[PDB]
Symmetry: D2
Subunit: 250 residues, 4 copies
């Protein structure tokens, strides 16, 4: 239906937000390849959504540049030319800037920043000039808009994704590539990332944090991603789509 004919790569599509994006993309008629590092999780995730006629898992670390090439090749062979890239894989580290080790800094940036760069660069290269209505959806966060004292490297990575995506959006638009680039900025969402940080859900559910008084769910981010992947959003590029319970409005 709303994504008829689309062919999407969703990185980190085996749990949490990415899993829900994959789920709703398939529901709307897209063919999907989901990636993650853990093949046990990934093969189960794909089967939980559908058969191999509509979704497949590829084991791939988003920080692995060479694997990105193989990932597009595998997706093309399975489903035809890629039309949609969701750079969603990402990790956190609970450290202030002051307390961030250089190893933590480089590791987080290798996934959250390099991975989004590799996927955006290759997405442009693979999808430009093909009349596909192509769309690159880069997962930022409210932490790409406001700071947090205890996620210094994470803040750096999400602010970089925010503005790098604008550069790509502009170049694709000016060159008539038929590729749009936008960023999505979730507020707190119930995912393993949040579930595995003790007390995170309670802290983020305070009204001083999220005015709605609760955190979101992965489908809240899947539905804005369906909009940005569909041709309904053919005039949206370089823009920031914030789904955050009011977090950044105060």
């Amino acid at each position: 239906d709303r994504l008829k004919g689309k062919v999407a790569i969703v990185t980190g599509g085996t749990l949490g937000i990415g899993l829900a994006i994959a789920d709703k993309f398939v529901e709307e008629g897209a063919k999907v390849v989901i990636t993650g590092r853990h093949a046990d999780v990934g093969e189960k995730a794909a089967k939980s959504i559908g058969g191999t006629d509509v979704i497949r898992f590829v084991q791939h670390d988003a920080s692995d540049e060479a694997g990105w090439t193989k990932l597009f090749d595998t997706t093309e062979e399975a489903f035809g030319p890629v039309t949609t890239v969701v750079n969603n894989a990402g990790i956190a580290v609970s450290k202030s800037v002051e307390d961030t080790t250089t190893e933590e800094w480089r590791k987080l940036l290798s996934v959250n920043l390099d991975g989004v760069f590799f996927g955006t660069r290759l997405g442009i290269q693979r999808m430009k000039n093909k009349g596909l209505g192509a769309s690159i959806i880069n997962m930022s966060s409210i932490e790409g808009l406001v700071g947090d004292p205890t996620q210094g490297a994470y803040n750096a990575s999400k602010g970089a994704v925010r503005i790098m995506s604008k550069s790509a959006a502009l170049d694709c638009a000016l060159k008539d590539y038929d590729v749009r680039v936008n960023t999505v900025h979730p507020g707190p969402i119930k995912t393993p990332l949040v579930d595995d940080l003790e007390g995170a859900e309670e802290m983020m559910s305070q009204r001083t944090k999220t005015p709605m008084g609760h955190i979101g769910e992965p489908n809240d981010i899947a539905w804005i991603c369906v909009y940005l992947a569909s041709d309904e959003s053919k005039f949206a590029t370089g823009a920031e789509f914030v789904v955050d319970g009011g977090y950044t409005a105060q």
Copy 2:
């Protein structure tokens, strides 16, 4: 049926953006009342979308405070409790701040700002605490994000709507009203507002203005409004949804 059961007021819904919002709202299952000041244009507009079982026209100037209560009463008599208010009526004045007459200032603000205040205030009063999944969508502009040297009063109006809507969203969220408030920021859209302005489409299509090299169409704004009116966006409030061909990304 993405808007199953919704009951919407769309101000200025007889031409341009508002007409397309009303069109796509009816397509997705909403009952709609459109407003405008010209009864013959408006009755035809309504009938062009559907019968009185799904859409009706009400003559009402958005700057008319007393008429806002009658407009809600009329819509609820027709279709039941209002769930969705799109404050779309608006006008432009091609004057710099320096050259703006006080008459022009007050006239434009009485529509673009007073009207949005009236609809937002009454929408909250009439829709809160009824479990309706209510949504107030306030039409700002890229001109609520950046300035334009020849639309001073318009800039003032669109920046007011931008931040006033955040106040409403926060209060509704904190009080558990089940009412969301967001703003939409179109870039240039082919409408009578633009068509009646000699040279405007040619000017806005320059790559230094809109990187996509063309202006949008009314459905481009309709589809983001369908997203915001639907329960798909139940975690989006107090946020800005920009559909502008890249205008504000550079």
Copy 3:
């Protein structure tokens, strides 16, 4: 003397932030006219900063359009051509959008928005093309950047000032008028406005409001205005200068 030769109008210059702006403007060599509604308060304020050779009080309500041209005339007759206009007069209303009466809406906007419009429009007309290094400083707020659930009309006015100022800045720059226009966005500041609201300073001093754990002082806003009025800022126009204890960074 960083404001050597400057001649400044500071509306609402008899108490609080405006008083300190006037005070530091005189310390830096400017001649200053302060305005306010109450003559006993205003004559005492002017005298508390200096003599009539450097500062004078003029009774003028910023919402009074007719009084604006007389205010420029009086200042120029006293001190020579006006070079600097600080649109600082403003009022607050502690009401949600839902709870705002139309009288309260119109009244607040008549001061906070009309007054800034009147001073900016006249300031451009009377200062352009005279080699004065002219500067218009419009007092917005953090409430021009984020919403507050019980400051609806105030939010509307401060967002309007934010974007209307950009329009003016751009027109002046493109026409080589030698007039810059910028906005200042104070966070909470200890002033009679804040002193009169019982509990406001305690509430705004919580870390979830102001991360520094205390509110600012009027000189905090005076010093950014000195920078903006001086030729040090000859390349700054259309920009937002935020002095807020970290309030909007989280």
Copy 4:
């Protein structure tokens, strides 16, 4: 005068913007250490401003992590505890995201992002809790606010610096460290970086780029840095100070 008793490190302080920051810092009474990679240029730069009692050059690549500790030790041995860190060193690469090689990407980020991280992290460690009125000034750019189609890696780096600085600002504020962190966002400035790229100043001077119709000068950025280093800005933290001729206001 305005920087009495301050002790500043200015990275990349031997040319362009950084040289002028150093020049005005010394004029206002600060002791300054400027860094650069080229020793002959650097010693001449320092001598051009003053003697070793007020300014000294230290050869240091901002991307060199271990050298940062030596740089702080050298500065403190010369002038006493560092109070002020200006992370100004930075490089550009004229490539779209699509055309950026991974080595170009890594190289630019090692200076523009890692260097700002290293200086901010160590600055907090070395200046907190000492009553210095410490200030960390991180040089972003208008390219941290909007995208540029031919500056992909640069855009990423400047957006990272923008939001990473908010994290640090908040942490320092919440912990009462007496350390402030802010970002400066120059528009086009006549410097060797701009001079050495053929067609830079001509293109940036077009009204569609810079509404003032000309680019800035290094002193334009020096003076906002003076304000941010001084105690005049003791209530400013986590904020963005834009000096860009109106570039981002349209």
